[PDB]
Structures are given as structure tokens and as C-alpha cells.
Amino acid sequence: MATRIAILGAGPSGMAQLRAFQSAQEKGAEIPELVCFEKQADWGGQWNYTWRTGLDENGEPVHSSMYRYLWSNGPKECLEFADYTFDEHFGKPIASYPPREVLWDYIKGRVEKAGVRKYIRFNTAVRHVEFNEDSQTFTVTVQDHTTDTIYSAAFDYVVCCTGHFSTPYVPEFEGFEKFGGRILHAHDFRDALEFKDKTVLLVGSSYSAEDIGSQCYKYGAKKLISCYRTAPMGYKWPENWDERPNLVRVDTENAYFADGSSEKVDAIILCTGYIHHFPFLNDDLRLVTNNRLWPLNLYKGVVWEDNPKFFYIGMQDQWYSFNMFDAQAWYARDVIMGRLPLPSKEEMKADSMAWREKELTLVTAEEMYTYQGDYIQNLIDMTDYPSFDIPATNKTFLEWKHHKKENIMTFRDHSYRSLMTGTMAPKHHTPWIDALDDSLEAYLS
Amino acid sequence: MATRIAILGAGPSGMAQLRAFQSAQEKGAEIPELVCFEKQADWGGQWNYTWRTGLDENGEPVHSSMYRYLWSNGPKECLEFADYTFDEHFGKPIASYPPREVLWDYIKGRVEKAGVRKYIRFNTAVRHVEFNEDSQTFTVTVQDHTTDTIYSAAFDYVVCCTGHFSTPYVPEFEGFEKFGGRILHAHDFRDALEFKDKTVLLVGSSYSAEDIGSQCYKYGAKKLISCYRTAPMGYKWPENWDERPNLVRVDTENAYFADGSSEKVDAIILCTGYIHHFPFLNDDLRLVTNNRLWPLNLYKGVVWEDNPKFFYIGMQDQWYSFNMFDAQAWYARDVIMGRLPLPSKEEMKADSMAWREKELTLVTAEEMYTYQGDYIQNLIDMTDYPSFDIPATNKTFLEWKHHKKENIMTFRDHSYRSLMTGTMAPKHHTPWIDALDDSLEAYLS
Ligand SMILES: Cc1cc2nc3c(=O)[nH]c(=O)nc-3n(C[C@H](O)[C@H](O)[C@H](O)COP(=O)(O)OP(=O)(O)OC[C@H]3O[C@@H](n4cnc5c(N)ncnc54)[C@H](O)[C@@H]3O)c2cc1C
Ligand SMILES: Cc1cc2nc3c(=O)[nH]c(=O)nc-3n(C[C@H](O)[C@H](O)[C@H](O)COP(=O)(O)OP(=O)(O)OC[C@H]3O[C@@H](n4cnc5c(N)ncnc54)[C@H](O)[C@@H]3O)c2cc1C
Ligand SMILES: Nc1ncnc2c1ncn2[C@@H]1O[C@H](COP(=O)(O)OP(=O)(O)OC[C@H]2OC[C@H](O)[C@@H]2O)[C@@H](O)[C@H]1OP(=O)(O)O
Ligand SMILES: Nc1ncnc2c1ncn2[C@@H]1O[C@H](COP(=O)(O)OP(=O)(O)OC[C@H]2OC[C@H](O)[C@@H]2O)[C@@H](O)[C@H]1OP(=O)(O)O
């Protein structure tokens, strides 16, 4: 086919985008030339673990925010590919909340099967994307770190897949320049063992704080302190872990909270989340948003409204994840291919405004993942992407919510049914708190 | 003047470039318009300390490599402005090896005096510099993080001052993904107290290894271990500090050397240096070199030979430093202003080749700083920058060498005379090992 496409990033989303085109071709259609650029030496994005921190071996910002002993925080059943099942990949049932290495193996399995590795240029950082009015094409400039060469190439469309949980939001507190312990962001957190026998303040009250706390807890930290800005997380933590209102300052050794309280602290971890940052785009192409279920300026959450030859995959906040990226990649594919022509700019705006109105109505966690599910439904209904039971995927989310509330440290110890196959997942061979080994090999025997 | 100049960065180099222009104007010349861009909230470069690590508050790679308790490692007398003396800044003699905050105050003071702040756009990262063949102008694209806007602007010349000790060289050793302590690069080193009562592996044998060990030692580390790749540093270290051949792998808790030895380690600090990295340049403009006294492709060490309307300040390795940047900035100024016209491309090449042949001749630390002083001498002779006594600066380095050999932990306790004023620096009020407070106010009272 005539056109040429650039895919930025080879994590879940970039992988999904390649997989969609490969599926079209398998079903016998003529597809566009495809070039995918990836700065790391392998695919999988967040899921590709690294010991590195800050800046990688080439000087690019280190991308992955993942740590030793990370395991899935939601049911694997909620993120199964509708076109490549857990049954198929592993050839047997496994429990509901696999470690990192395990879900990494599984996402790679689909793209190894699909043969799409050949499209990817690894160890290549994307530096600039420019749209040229005269030719109606994009110029993509990249740095190949294998050859140490900077070069560019022209493309008829561009799909951005570079993630939005990699560039840290890192607020400052009074005294950080005097504190003698380590200060780091959740993004920098690697092995919980570095904190065995220590007192660790975790600043913030979301998924980052919840899990990094647990890992420090699980691996012997003397004591834990979470501070919240708005409201407490609210779970019943173990004995040596307590919650209090915000940090307000720190000194050579101590932390002070709005409590009036205060104590000795050895390390501070900022679990204050991330920013959407696209250093390779100018203001004509660059999405500016806070983290949320509905960023503005994206038709069907995917098409950039000022230049609809540019697409974004996976830039919403994530209740659903892998199968959301699929539904987005299938939709992007079909517009690029001519199968779903775009409406007028006014029409896109009116649609996008109606989704945002509904977003702002949203109050409870249940209302939120359901909304995201209605979004996914609408996308998969437009595409030969296989439909699956979204209302039951939400009930699975509901269950998970209850398990977390019942007991924060044992939610991972439960099991759920695949919406793709029907099978119930078997209980894991070891309780969470005792499963100290994070390796694939030990999870599967 | 008709022309417009961009200065990239506002550390010592950027500061020196502005100051050079300011000086000419003060003596009555018409000067170009100047725009200087700086990604941090304030000037000073390495010398502007931050507690931050990896990526700053805006997503930009954090720039400074400086830690708590850093002091000058060479005689202040070797880095004094020939146009702005230590007497004039501080109003009174002071010792020879000032703490960071103290040299920071001193470099700002020249530029506060000069009134050149008004030329700087702070909190602005340079993304891209392109040369347009049609206009013979550069387009500079930047991101203003105050307004969150990306915009560009056209310049007749560009002076790059973004440094080369900020992007870390970070080799991998077998086992790093399995070790449970902190691994970090010298660039990420902040407060030595994070390592009180610990055993610390320091990988490397140069200025970073020397001085980061010494701070870990001075603030109460249990034990130190340096490993070298080529040759030992060879200084007499305290009892709990020992040197040995290179690291070769690591496990859950331990380090293994070529010794065949091995022991328990809590943290690893890669003191392996830095890479010249310019993400905002294509290959037509982009210097590529290892760290050394004579990079190729720079006429007089400063004019980019493939496009001589683009200049680099201070990209050499640094024995001299602040007065080298001034000699360079003064030279750049004069070429930009038309005072010193350039020879042909062939003659630049022959001249640079002659400097590289001599660079290769160099064996002893003395031959090296003498070569850099021959370099600086040839630069300052071309310009109204005030000549100063290089032979005598060299002798002050020689004295410095011997004191470090004599005793690595007390070289900071000596004093030397100013080549600018003649005055002998008084002994400091506290010996190094005991002066635990790094503050300007404590150093000055
Ligand atoms: C700590 C953490 C834990 C998480 N846990 C879960 C979980 O348990 N379950 C779940 O469903 N989701 C989880 N997530 C959600 C995560 O966002 C998705 O799982 C998924 O990783 C996002 O896919 P992506 O491909 O869109 O982005 P990413 O996985 O972030 O991939 C981005 C890719 O783009 C590349 N890239 C970026 N910039 C450039 C550039 N300039 N040039 C070249 N390449 C570039 C990166 O190398 C990377 O390969 C977690 C996220 C984090 C941060
Ligand atoms: C740990 C350490 C200790 C040192 N100690 C000494 C010492 O004791 N004595 C001595 O003489 N020298 C020392 N040095 C040497 C040091 O390089 C020089 O003194 C001086 O800092 C070099 O000045 P510079 O302006 O050329 O570079 P820098 O000080 O590094 O300045 C670079 C500037 O450019 C900015 N910049 C970079 N990229 C961008 C961009 N994309 N957009 C906008 N701005 C950008 C940075 O913010 C920074 O302000 C030390 C260096 C290090 C790393
Ligand atoms: N200054 C300050 N003081 C105290 N607290 C602050 C401050 N600034 C932000 N925050 C809190 O940090 C948290 C950020 O949460 P989140 O965005 O989900 O980020 P996560 O890293 O937890 O990522 C979650 C997602 O990534 C992967 C995972 O699966 C989820 O999809 C949240 O509680 C914040 O606001 P608030 O006022 O605290 O409500
Ligand atoms: N793979 C590996 N294994 C072990 N050791 C390695 C390895 N790779 C490099 N190195 C050593 O790291 C050190 C880097 O030296 P330097 O360039 O002075 O960087 P610094 O940060 O010390 O220099 C700071 C400079 O900045 C400012 C200061 O004033 C100096 O001018 C040096 O000893 C290296 O070469 P070698 O083979 O080890 O000799």
C-alpha cells in the first residue's frame, strides 16, 4: 500500500499497533509500510525491567518505573488480550496476579507469534516530529545509538505510543537540601531490600504509595509513614505502617507534618505521580493534559483534533489497560486504512465535549471503570476487534475493589474467571506475603 | 549591531560569554543582540546545587553533578578571574579551597556586577538548533516551562555552553539486576550521610572516586572500596578504605573482583565519568568526542569547523577552568564581532591537526596542564582579555600535585598566592576533616 507509518514506542501500545496491522494483513488486506522506533534495547515498555535510574546507557531518560517484586495490581483477567489468551500463551491455568516477568513474557508472546519484531528499530530515540504543510507528511528525526547517527525520514501518519507514567511529577518540600537521607521519586525505586531495617516516608496516597509501601513492608523495613494531601488511603495497614496528613518540612533527620507530629526518617520516596511530556513534539502536535479518564483534544480518545493524521495510544488514565490499547490500536488502524472516515472538525469537537461532560459527572471508583468500559465498548463496536464481556469485566473490577478493602495485604491472594475462556484461575502455590522470589521460573513450577 | 546571538546555557561558560560582550560594550563598542537560554531557575551551572536527581521538576535531565560538602579540588588561585578578583568579590583574603556555595557566590558576583542577567531566559530548555542554508541563520527551538510553550527564534550565531559532565557514562556489571543495595552514578550522589555506617563500592579511579570516597569517609561510612580498571589511584588511604582490581560481578549482597576476592557491599557508586551529549543538535552541528585536552573539529578549541558560525565553550577536559572559559569566550566574541577573521577551512584543519599531534605526545600530569596553559596563552594573546601569569599558574598546579601525593586527606589544608593580586591566602579556620558545615556563612565567619 502507498502510505508509510511511524510508530513511536514499542511497549504494550506500540506492540498493539503493530499487532493490529499484522492482523489485517493476515486476514488478507494490503497494509501501509510500518516503522516503529524504540529507545530501549527490547520491547515491553514499563514491563521491561532495568536496574538503571535517571538516565540510561545512552543518556536518554530511563523509561521504566518498575521495581523488583512488582506484581500485577489488578486481575490479569481484566487485561487479557481478546485475540491471544492466557490459556494459549502458557498452555495451563495460572493465578490472578502474576509478577512482572510473567506478564512481560505474555505480552511478548503475542508479538513474537505475530512476527512484527522485524518492523522495530531498537536503541533509537525519537527527537523531533514536524508536520510539513506543503507535502502533507511528517518528518521524524531520530538518534540511532547503535550507529551513533542522527537521521530523518518522512511518514504519512504518526502513531504516538511513548507512555505517560515515565516523567516524574516531583514536588519540592522545605528543607530537602538539608535532609541527609536519600530522596527519590517512585520512578527511581528499584529493590525494596535497599530499605531493610529503615524508616521510610512515602509521600502521596495512590497506587504508587500503596504498592511501594507494601514492598518495603514485605522486605523488612523497620517502619513506614504515608502522608496524604487530600484524604487518606484508608486501608488497615500493618503495625509499623501509619498514615498522617501532609509532610510540611524536613530537617537534617526529621519530617514534620500538619499533624504537629514529627519523627526520624531515613529515606523519602515521592509517590506523587507523573506528567505527560513529549520532548519530540511542538505545540501543533503536543498533548497537554493532567492524568485523567478523558483528556481533551482527542477524537475517540485517540485522534489528535488539530492534525488528524497524528494519533495517540493509551494516554488516558488506566483502569482497563492492555485491551483498551488494543481497542484504540484497531481504531487507529482502521482510520489510517480508510475503513472509518473521520467526521468534520466541528463534529469531533462536539463528540469530545460530550465525553468530557460525562467524565465530570463521575464520583465513585465504580462509575469510573464503568465509564472507561463504555469507552472501550464504543471503540470495539467499530472494529473487527473481537467483542468480550465488558459488563462482566467491570464486575471483576468490583470484586477486586472489595478484596482490597477486606485486606490490603492479601488482595493478590484471590482468583477470577477469564472473560475470554471461562476457566477459573487456580489459587497461587504461595501466599503473597511469603512469595519472596519474583521470578517467572518460580511462579510457574 | 545588526546581528543576533544565542548562548546555550548559563553556567560559568554562558556567564563568561555574556561577560565578554558586556565588557566590549562597557569599553564603548556596538555589540550584537544577545539571547541566553537556561533550563534551570538560576545561573551557575554545576555550581547551582540541587537535591534533585535524574529528571528535574519539568522533565528535563537534572544537570548538576555536585553534592553536599563539595569543595574546590584545586587551588582557587588557579581559577580566578583576571578581571574580577577574589579580593574584590569578598573584600578580604580567604583560604584556598572554598566550598561550592562559596565559589557559586563568586562566579555570580561578576555577572551581577556586569548587569547581564537581563539577557537570560531561565526555566527554558533548548530542544533543537537547525541551520537554514537559504537565510544563513540558525533556528533555535526551546521550551519555556514557565509558560509551558514551545517557540522558536532565529539567530545569526550560536555559542553552545551546555557542558560535558552532566550526562553520565554508566557501564553495566553482571548481576546488577539482582543486587539489593543502591546502585547509582557519581552524578546522582547527594548527601554522604545517606551512607553513614555502610560499606560502599566506588567503581572508577579519577576525580570522582577520590573525592566521593573522601566525603563518604569524612561523614562516617563504615568501610570503603575502590576498584580500578587500568591502574590504582595509588594514594595512601585511611584504614577502612582499600583499592583493588576491577569489579567483575555482583550477587544479592556481594561484590566480586579480579583479585579473586569478594565481600559484602551496601551501595555501589559508579564513578565512571560522562559523555558529550547534545540532544538538541543534528550531525551537521554535533561535537562527538571522548573527554580529552584536544577535541578535534574545533578551530582554536572553539570554532565548529564544519559551520564556523557555531561555537563551543569549554568542551575540553579541565585542568584550568574558569579562566580558560573566559579566554575562549573572549575569542568567540572577537570572531563574532569581526575583530578576528577566520582562516580558510583547510588552514583550520592543519592547525587543529598540529594541536592533536602535540596532545598525543603528552605523558605526565605536568605536561598536560602545561599544554592547556599553552592553549590558554595563545587564546589570551589574541584578545584584550588581560594576560596573567601562566608559568606561575602552572607552578601552583605543581605544588597542588605534591600536596595531594603527600597526603590525600589534607591537601585542602594548604594555601597559595593569587596570580592576580600577589596576596597569600590565609589558612582556613578549621582543618578540612573537621569542617563539617559546608555553608558559605560558616566558611566566611
Ligand atoms: C509502576 C507501574 C506499575 C504498573 N502496573 C500495572 C499493572 O499492574 N497492570 C496494568 O494493567 N497496568 C499497569 N501499569 C500501567 C502501564 O501504563 C501499562 O501497563 C503499560 O505499560 C502502558 O503501555 P504503553 O506502551 O502505552 O506505555 P509504556 O509501557 O510506558 O511504553 C512506552 C514505550 O515508549 C518508549 N519511548 C518513550 N519515549 C521514547 C522516545 N523518545 N524514543 C523512542 N522510544 C520512546 C519507551 O521506551 C517505552 O518502550 C503500571 C504502570 C507503572 C508506571
Ligand atoms: C562533580 C564536579 C565537581 C567539579 N569541581 C570543580 C572544581 O572544584 N574546580 C573547577 O575548576 N571545576 C570543577 N568542575 C568542572 C566544571 O565543569 C566547571 O567548573 C564548570 O562547571 C564548567 O562550566 P560550563 O558552564 O562550561 O558547564 P556547566 O557548569 O555544566 O553548565 C552547563 C549549563 O548549561 C545548561 N544546559 C545544559 N543543557 C541545556 C539545555 N538543553 N537547555 C538549556 N540549558 C542547558 C545547564 O543548565 C547548565 O547551566 C567540577 C565538575 C563536576 C561535574
Ligand atoms: N505535593 C503533594 N503532596 C502530597 N501528595 C501529592 C502531592 N502532589 C501529588 N500528590 C499525590 O500523589 C498521588 C499521585 O497519584 P497518581 O496520579 O495515581 O500516581 P501513581 O504513581 O500512584 O500512579 C497510578 C497509576 O500508575 C500505574 C497504576 O496502575 C495507576 O494507573 C496522588 O495521591 C496525589 O494527589 P492527591 O491530592 O494525593 O489526591
Ligand atoms: N567499565 C569501567 N569499569 C571500571 N572503571 C571504569 C569503567 N569505565 C570507566 N571507568 C573509570 O571511570 C573514571 C572516569 O574518569 P573521568 O573521565 O575523570 O570521570 P570523573 O567523573 O572521575 O571525572 C570528573 C572530571 O570532572 C570534573 C573533575 O574536575 C574532572 O575533570 C576513570 O577512572 C575511568 O577510566 P580508567 O580506565 O578507569 O582510568
Side-chain angles (χ1 to χ4, degrees):
Chain A
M1 202 188 308
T3 62
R4 202 156 172 264
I5 316 305
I7 295 158
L8 315 186
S13 299
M15 296 159 104
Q17 197 61 264
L18 294 162
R19 174 65 169 169
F21 278 107
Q22 179 274 331
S23 284
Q25 176 180 71
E26 179 63 7
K27 285 173 201 216
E30 212 156 7
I31 61 163
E33 309 266 39
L34 312 170
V35 180
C36 173
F37 298 106
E38 170 54 65
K39 73 175 153 172
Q40 286 174 249
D42 208 359
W43 47 25
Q46 285 292 346
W47 307 88
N48 183 8
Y49 177 84
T50 177
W51 57 271
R52 293 171 182 281
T53 250
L55 267 28
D56 79 10
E57 88 264 23
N58 299 138
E60 306 304 331
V62 172
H63 176 76
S64 167
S65 278
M66 278 185 165
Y67 40 72
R68 306 291 326 264
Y69 333 126
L70 183 145
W71 294 26
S72 173
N73 14 70
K76 83 172 198 286
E77 278 76 37
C78 283
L79 91 220
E80 196 170 3
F81 298 137
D83 84 327
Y84 184 79
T85 64
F86 286 121
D87 281 338
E88 183 187 335
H89 171 69
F90 294 108
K92 43 128 149 178
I94 61 159
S96 280
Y97 295 80
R100 211 211 84 248
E101 206 181 347
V102 174
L103 283 187
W104 189 41
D105 193 75
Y106 166 68
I107 65 186
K108 293 181 283 169
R110 187 180 63 173
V111 291
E112 280 155 6
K113 191 189 194 189
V116 302
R117 206 202 175 71
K118 60 162 168 199
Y119 294 113
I120 302 178
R121 309 186 193 169
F122 295 98
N123 210 24
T124 303
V126 167
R127 285 259 168 273
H128 209 341
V129 173
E130 276 160 317
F131 179 70
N132 320 297
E133 272 304 349
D134 295 332
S135 42
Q136 300 274 117
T137 66
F138 291 88
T139 295
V140 179
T141 307
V142 303
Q143 174 156 202
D144 175 352
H145 291 293
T146 302
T147 61
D148 194 33
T149 278
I150 295 178
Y151 69 79
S152 75
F155 292 89
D156 295 280
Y157 298 87
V158 169
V159 191
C160 189
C161 294
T162 54
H164 64 96
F165 296 130
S166 283
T167 302
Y169 179 61
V170 196
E172 191 166 64
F173 293 84
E174 202 194 307
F176 271 4
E177 67 290 14
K178 281 143 162 190
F179 183 68
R182 179 173 176 201
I183 307 195
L184 70 149
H185 183 277
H187 175 73
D188 302 315
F189 178 65
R190 289 275 180 290
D191 198 324
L193 289 188
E194 157 190 349
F195 302 95
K196 197 172 181 301
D197 299 321
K198 282 128 140 231
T199 313
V200 174
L201 175 63
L202 295 152
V203 177
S205 65
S206 188
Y207 302 90
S208 245
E210 285 171 21
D211 207 73
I212 290 168
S214 302
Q215 308 291 338
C216 291
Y217 170 79
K218 179 165 152 161
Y219 291 72
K222 182 184 284 152
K223 193 195 205 286
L224 302 181
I225 325 171
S226 291
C227 58
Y228 57 93
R229 174 176 61 186
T230 308
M233 287 177 276
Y235 301 111
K236 196 56 211 297
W237 307 107
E239 252 208 324
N240 58 335
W241 183 342
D242 78 86
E243 272 204 272
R244 61 192 84 188
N246 214 10
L247 179 67
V248 314
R249 85 181 165 92
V250 125
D251 61 26
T252 287
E253 287 171 72
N254 299 305
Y256 302 66
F257 306 76
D259 249 4
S261 86
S262 132
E263 78 202 74
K264 205 265 186 325
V265 148
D266 293 316
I268 305 159
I269 307 183
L270 300 163
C271 310
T272 32
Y274 300 88
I275 67 199
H276 288 69
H277 172 71
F278 309 97
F280 49 78
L281 308 175
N282 301 341
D283 286 358
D284 52 335
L285 296 178
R286 177 193 150 238
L287 172 72
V288 175
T289 190
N290 62 312
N291 196 32
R292 62 188 302 153
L293 290 167
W294 195 259
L296 214 58
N297 224 255
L298 308 165
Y299 183 55
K300 305 292 190 184
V302 156
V303 186
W304 177 245
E305 285 174 341
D306 293 337
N307 186 345
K309 283 161 132 263
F310 199 92
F311 307 81
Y312 279 103
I313 312 295
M315 295 291 162
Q316 293 70 20
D317 192 17
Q318 274 150 41
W319 287 91
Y320 285 79
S321 64
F322 298 168
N323 55 50
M324 183 166 69
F325 317 135
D326 281 12
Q328 304 175 138
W330 262 247
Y331 175 71
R333 177 194 69 185
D334 275 19
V335 4
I336 293 168
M337 279 181 76
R339 282 159 186 201
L340 291 161
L342 258 16
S344 84
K345 193 181 158 152
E346 277 185 25
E347 282 173 294
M348 289 185 303
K349 250 70 187 90
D351 190 268
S352 288
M353 164 167 83
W355 282 86
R356 162 62 66 82
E357 287 171 340
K358 199 79 167 68
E359 187 203 32
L360 292 164
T361 264
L362 268 20
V363 192
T364 69
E366 193 185 354
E367 281 168 332
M368 290 171 179
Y369 55 71
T370 302
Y371 174 90
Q372 189 158 85
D374 290 321
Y375 163 61
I376 295 171
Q377 188 67 69
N378 174 269
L379 288 183
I380 68 181
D381 292 344
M382 296 190 301
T383 264
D384 78 340
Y385 197 80
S387 77
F388 62 91
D389 191 342
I390 278 140
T393 305
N394 306 326
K395 281 314 103 37
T396 311
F397 279 116
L398 180 67
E399 268 193 85
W400 168 79
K401 260 290 134 156
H402 286 137
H403 294 165
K404 275 181 74 155
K405 250 201 150 93
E406 286 168 12
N407 184 3
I408 198 67
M409 299 289 158
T410 64
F411 74 81
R412 298 195 149 93
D413 283 316
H414 305 269
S415 262
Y416 314 90
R417 45 168 26 94
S418 158
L419 299 321
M420 314 295 161
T421 61
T423 61
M424 259 288 294
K427 188 200 160 53
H428 190 43
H429 68 49
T430 308
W432 173 68
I433 185 97
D434 302 299
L436 242 50
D437 195 335
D438 64 358
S439 86
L440 160 327
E441 183 181 276
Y443 180 90
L444 290 175
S445 69
Chain B
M1 245 190 295
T3 73
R4 205 158 171 257
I5 316 299
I7 292 160
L8 312 175
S13 283
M15 294 163 114
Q17 196 59 261
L18 290 162
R19 168 67 172 177
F21 275 103
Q22 187 271 324
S23 274
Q25 176 177 68
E26 179 68 3
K27 287 170 207 221
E30 206 141 22
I31 59 170
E33 319 273 28
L34 310 163
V35 174
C36 172
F37 298 104
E38 169 56 60
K39 73 169 157 169
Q40 289 167 250
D42 203 5
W43 45 24
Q46 284 284 352
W47 306 89
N48 180 19
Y49 176 81
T50 188
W51 56 268
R52 293 185 179 279
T53 240
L55 259 35
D56 67 19
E57 87 262 44
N58 292 137
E60 301 304 333
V62 164
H63 177 79
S64 175
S65 289
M66 290 193 161
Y67 35 72
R68 312 287 323 266
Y69 330 128
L70 181 140
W71 304 16
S72 158
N73 11 72
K76 88 175 190 276
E77 279 83 17
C78 290
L79 90 217
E80 179 168 29
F81 303 118
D83 76 327
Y84 185 75
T85 69
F86 284 110
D87 296 332
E88 174 184 356
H89 174 62
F90 295 107
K92 49 120 154 165
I94 63 165
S96 280
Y97 295 87
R100 206 210 87 239
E101 211 196 336
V102 174
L103 296 183
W104 189 37
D105 197 80
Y106 170 66
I107 72 190
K108 304 185 270 191
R110 181 173 69 168
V111 292
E112 276 144 1
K113 195 194 183 190
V116 312
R117 218 184 162 89
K118 56 175 185 182
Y119 298 124
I120 307 169
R121 303 192 192 164
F122 293 97
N123 211 23
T124 297
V126 177
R127 301 260 158 261
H128 207 350
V129 175
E130 279 156 314
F131 183 67
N132 319 285
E133 278 299 348
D134 305 336
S135 44
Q136 295 288 115
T137 69
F138 298 89
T139 300
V140 179
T141 313
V142 300
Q143 178 163 199
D144 177 346
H145 294 289
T146 306
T147 60
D148 196 31
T149 285
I150 295 168
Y151 72 75
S152 65
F155 292 85
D156 294 288
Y157 300 82
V158 181
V159 183
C160 187
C161 299
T162 51
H164 61 102
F165 297 134
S166 283
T167 301
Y169 180 66
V170 205
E172 196 174 59
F173 292 82
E174 183 192 331
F176 274 8
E177 66 289 10
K178 274 168 173 168
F179 178 69
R182 184 178 176 189
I183 314 174
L184 72 141
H185 185 273
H187 171 79
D188 310 309
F189 183 67
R190 288 296 179 264
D191 194 315
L193 302 177
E194 151 195 353
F195 304 108
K196 187 172 187 317
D197 303 322
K198 281 151 162 206
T199 318
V200 178
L201 186 44
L202 294 151
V203 183
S205 66
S206 186
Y207 305 81
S208 266
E210 290 173 17
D211 200 270
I212 287 165
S214 306
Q215 311 286 345
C216 285
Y217 167 81
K218 173 177 172 171
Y219 292 69
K222 176 189 293 147
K223 187 196 211 307
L224 296 191
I225 318 166
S226 291
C227 59
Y228 54 86
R229 173 178 65 177
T230 313
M233 303 186 240
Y235 297 111
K236 202 61 224 324
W237 307 111
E239 269 211 338
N240 61 330
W241 186 336
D242 77 82
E243 262 204 89
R244 68 184 73 171
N246 216 14
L247 183 59
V248 319
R249 90 190 160 94
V250 133
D251 57 29
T252 278
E253 278 164 86
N254 293 300
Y256 295 76
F257 314 81
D259 243 0
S261 70
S262 135
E263 77 211 68
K264 197 274 188 312
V265 162
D266 299 306
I268 306 181
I269 305 182
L270 300 166
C271 301
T272 40
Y274 295 93
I275 57 176
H276 283 66
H277 170 69
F278 311 97
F280 50 86
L281 299 186
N282 307 333
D283 282 359
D284 57 332
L285 290 185
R286 179 191 150 235
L287 180 61
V288 173
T289 189
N290 57 318
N291 191 34
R292 64 195 293 162
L293 298 173
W294 192 263
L296 208 55
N297 226 238
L298 301 172
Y299 182 58
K300 300 289 196 197
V302 164
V303 179
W304 175 243
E305 307 181 323
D306 278 335
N307 186 331
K309 275 160 136 271
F310 191 99
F311 310 76
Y312 283 95
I313 309 302
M315 287 304 166
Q316 288 73 18
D317 185 18
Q318 275 152 35
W319 290 89
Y320 291 60
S321 72
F322 301 168
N323 53 41
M324 178 164 68
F325 317 141
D326 288 6
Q328 301 175 140
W330 261 244
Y331 170 72
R333 179 195 79 192
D334 283 10
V335 348
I336 286 168
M337 278 176 81
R339 295 157 171 196
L340 285 163
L342 259 9
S344 78
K345 201 186 152 142
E346 279 184 28
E347 308 170 71
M348 289 185 294
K349 253 68 172 106
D351 189 270
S352 295
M353 166 167 81
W355 282 89
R356 162 58 68 73
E357 294 160 338
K358 192 95 175 72
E359 188 215 23
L360 298 165
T361 267
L362 267 26
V363 189
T364 65
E366 186 179 353
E367 279 163 337
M368 289 162 187
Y369 59 76
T370 304
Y371 175 93
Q372 193 162 80
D374 287 332
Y375 169 53
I376 290 170
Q377 184 71 76
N378 173 276
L379 291 172
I380 67 171
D381 290 345
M382 286 193 300
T383 260
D384 80 342
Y385 194 80
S387 65
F388 65 96
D389 192 336
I390 280 142
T393 304
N394 301 322
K395 284 323 92 40
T396 316
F397 279 116
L398 177 71
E399 279 193 83
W400 175 73
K401 252 306 119 141
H402 289 138
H403 290 157
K404 273 181 87 171
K405 241 200 167 78
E406 281 168 23
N407 183 354
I408 193 65
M409 299 287 158
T410 54
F411 73 88
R412 293 181 154 109
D413 281 320
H414 314 261
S415 272
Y416 317 83
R417 66 176 3 106
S418 162
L419 294 318
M420 309 301 168
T421 54
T423 52
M424 253 290 266
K427 187 179 165 69
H428 192 44
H429 77 48
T430 306
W432 183 68
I433 187 94
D434 290 304
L436 251 41
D437 195 340
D438 62 7
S439 95
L440 161 323
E441 176 193 279
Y443 179 98
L444 289 187
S445 83

mmCIF file with all atom_site columns, all heavy atoms in Angstrom, chain B residues 54 66 111 324:
data_model
loop_
_atom_site.group_PDB
_atom_site.id
_atom_site.type_symbol
_atom_site.label_atom_id
_atom_site.label_alt_id
_atom_site.label_comp_id
_atom_site.label_asym_id
_atom_site.label_entity_id
_atom_site.label_seq_id
_atom_site.pdbx_PDB_ins_code
_atom_site.Cartn_x
_atom_site.Cartn_y
_atom_site.Cartn_z
_atom_site.occupancy
_atom_site.B_iso_or_equiv
_atom_site.pdbx_formal_charge
_atom_site.auth_seq_id
_atom_site.auth_comp_id
_atom_site.auth_asym_id
_atom_site.auth_atom_id
_atom_site.pdbx_PDB_model_num
ATOM 1  N N   . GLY B 1 54  ? 18.225 12.526 38.609 1.00 0.00 ? 54  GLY B N   1
ATOM 2  C CA  . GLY B 1 54  ? 17.634 12.086 37.325 1.00 0.00 ? 54  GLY B CA  1
ATOM 3  C C   . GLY B 1 54  ? 16.967 13.190 36.445 1.00 0.00 ? 54  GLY B C   1
ATOM 4  O O   . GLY B 1 54  ? 17.619 13.839 35.620 1.00 0.00 ? 54  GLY B O   1
ATOM 5  N N   . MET B 1 66  ? 26.987 17.975 41.405 1.00 0.00 ? 66  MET B N   1
ATOM 6  C CA  . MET B 1 66  ? 27.560 18.403 42.685 1.00 0.00 ? 66  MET B CA  1
ATOM 7  C C   . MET B 1 66  ? 26.774 17.978 43.899 1.00 0.00 ? 66  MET B C   1
ATOM 8  O O   . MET B 1 66  ? 25.525 17.957 43.909 1.00 0.00 ? 66  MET B O   1
ATOM 9  C CB  . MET B 1 66  ? 27.787 19.910 42.659 1.00 0.00 ? 66  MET B CB  1
ATOM 10 C CG  . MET B 1 66  ? 28.912 20.159 41.707 1.00 0.00 ? 66  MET B CG  1
ATOM 11 S SD  . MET B 1 66  ? 29.523 21.772 41.854 1.00 0.00 ? 66  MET B SD  1
ATOM 12 C CE  . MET B 1 66  ? 31.131 21.568 41.064 1.00 0.00 ? 66  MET B CE  1
ATOM 13 N N   . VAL B 1 111 ? 28.820 38.513 37.442 1.00 0.00 ? 111 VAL B N   1
ATOM 14 C CA  . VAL B 1 111 ? 27.819 38.743 36.430 1.00 0.00 ? 111 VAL B CA  1
ATOM 15 C C   . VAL B 1 111 ? 26.702 39.619 36.981 1.00 0.00 ? 111 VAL B C   1
ATOM 16 O O   . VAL B 1 111 ? 25.966 40.262 36.208 1.00 0.00 ? 111 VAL B O   1
ATOM 17 C CB  . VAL B 1 111 ? 27.357 37.409 35.680 1.00 0.00 ? 111 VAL B CB  1
ATOM 18 C CG1 . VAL B 1 111 ? 28.474 36.906 34.867 1.00 0.00 ? 111 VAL B CG1 1
ATOM 19 C CG2 . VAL B 1 111 ? 26.916 36.310 36.643 1.00 0.00 ? 111 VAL B CG2 1
ATOM 20 N N   . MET B 1 324 ? 40.108 29.608 31.619 1.00 0.00 ? 324 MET B N   1
ATOM 21 C CA  . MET B 1 324 ? 40.048 29.047 30.271 1.00 0.00 ? 324 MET B CA  1
ATOM 22 C C   . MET B 1 324 ? 38.749 29.462 29.564 1.00 0.00 ? 324 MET B C   1
ATOM 23 O O   . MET B 1 324 ? 38.796 29.920 28.411 1.00 0.00 ? 324 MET B O   1
ATOM 24 C CB  . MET B 1 324 ? 40.179 27.525 30.289 1.00 0.00 ? 324 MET B CB  1
ATOM 25 C CG  . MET B 1 324 ? 40.084 26.855 28.898 1.00 0.00 ? 324 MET B CG  1
ATOM 26 S SD  . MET B 1 324 ? 40.682 25.169 28.860 1.00 0.00 ? 324 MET B SD  1
ATOM 27 C CE  . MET B 1 324 ? 39.435 24.385 29.857 1.00 0.00 ? 324 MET B CE  1
#
